[PDB]
Amino acid sequence: GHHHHHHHGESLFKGPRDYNPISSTICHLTNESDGHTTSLYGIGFGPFIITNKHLFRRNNGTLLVQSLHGVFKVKNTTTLQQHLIDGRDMIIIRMPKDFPPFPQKLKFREPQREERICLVTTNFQTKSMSSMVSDTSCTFPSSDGIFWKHWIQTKDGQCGSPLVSTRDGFIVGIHSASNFTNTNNYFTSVPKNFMELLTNQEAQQWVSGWRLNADSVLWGGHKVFMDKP
């Protein structure tokens, strides 16, 4: 809608960016437990998969993990080591040694007010998984900065997908939720010093068997329900 004028060459929108290094690390996760099944996405980094804490509403079954290297199944989710991100819908799963690790080239940082972001995903139904990038939205913190607002259309099942800065290609958060009318979307922001956490074992606090115990939670100033209506 905007016709530019009185510009500098540097004022133009950023040119093509290769999002394949990010999409090639995305995994599709299915936690099947107690008659329920929850599916959403995660981001691989080394031996870790970064995903939504609500994946673990339940923790008493199996975890199917679809990635670039194929499909792997964790027989008992309670054996998985987990690192919780305090007060955010984010958790890090440490995969067992027999799961092929991911590279460690991705960069994560806290989002910046008003910056332009896009949502990146991977299509697994195609024989060969294919990378997907959405149109661009600006972003702002909702409250204390735990959840950030975004205006990218997302379908059910895309939680965990990375929100990426078109400015520097860094991942600034993961998709988490919407209001009841699907008119405002929210992602969970990457916390401060996240790169330190991913690369310094002293900073990690691993537990196993952890789950949520309710159908709604109060994070970042919002009450969030597990299911809509």
Binding site: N52, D89, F147, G157, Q158, S176, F180, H222, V224, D227
Partner: peptide, 6 residues
Amino acid sequence: ENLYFQ
């Protein structure tokens, strides 16, 4: 506002 995990 109230939100729901998607």
